[PDB]
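Batch queue: ligand-bound targets. Current item pairs a single chain with calcium ion. No template structures supplied; prediction is de novo from sequence plus SMILES. Inputs echoed for audit trail.
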Amino acid sequence: MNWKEFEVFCVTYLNKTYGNKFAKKGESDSTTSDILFTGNNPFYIEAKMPHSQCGQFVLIPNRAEYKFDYSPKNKSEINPYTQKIMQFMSENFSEYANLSTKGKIIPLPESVFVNWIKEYYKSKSVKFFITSNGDFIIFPIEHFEHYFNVSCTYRIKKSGSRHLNSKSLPDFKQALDKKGISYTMRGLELHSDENIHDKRISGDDKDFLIKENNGAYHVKILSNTFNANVIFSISLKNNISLFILNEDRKAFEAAISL
DNA sequence: TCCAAGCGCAACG
DNA sequence: CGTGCGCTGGA
Ligand SMILES: [Ca+2]
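Prediction returned. Tokens below.
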């Protein structure tokens, strides 16, 4: 299954097992806002597939000072583990200043990355994680390292897309015309008997992406921003202590009962 | 309303 | 197993 199906899988399990107290609906925040436990002791439940990513922050190379600057537009504050990562990269500036999409791994102790993850998810009121190895596994953030292996890389991650809008619509119709695509527009929705799912076309400094949705195509404008972020990858352990697992399930059952 | 950017997510070649 | 689109301040 994909990660969206996985998250629904997790929510359904929580509600059927522990009562209909776990919400996954409405808008999300610019930070992690996954599953919400809606009881008297509320907290957010972060769902992770066995191979996932797990937080990030953008660093800007300062080639005059040979150090990395924390982006003022980042959405989490510098903690000591942020600082240890930045310090390591800055002391090794020439090794990290040539940005790449393949990334460069950061060889600090794994506990630095685990502690960053703990600090970040705690700050977003994420108190528990849920994952699955065939059985559901629920555990508190303070015990993260008993469940996931963690690594850390610095890589270019292109920013995301945005919806086609009215201002861009003439440009997009002209891009379809130039590419020879047969089409009709219903507002901002695209209709075509051609097979153009995942088609990429460009026009007037905009890269467009076409995606099939129900009975029409939805059109996106891709980003032109290619900044680099420290970003954490996690892999579910194959050797999880059943003792820690059991006490952590009780910790969850306590949290939802307070 | 619109755009650049950062964070969401494992996805995918 | 070694890359980026969908969504969400400030002008
Ligand atoms: Ca990594």
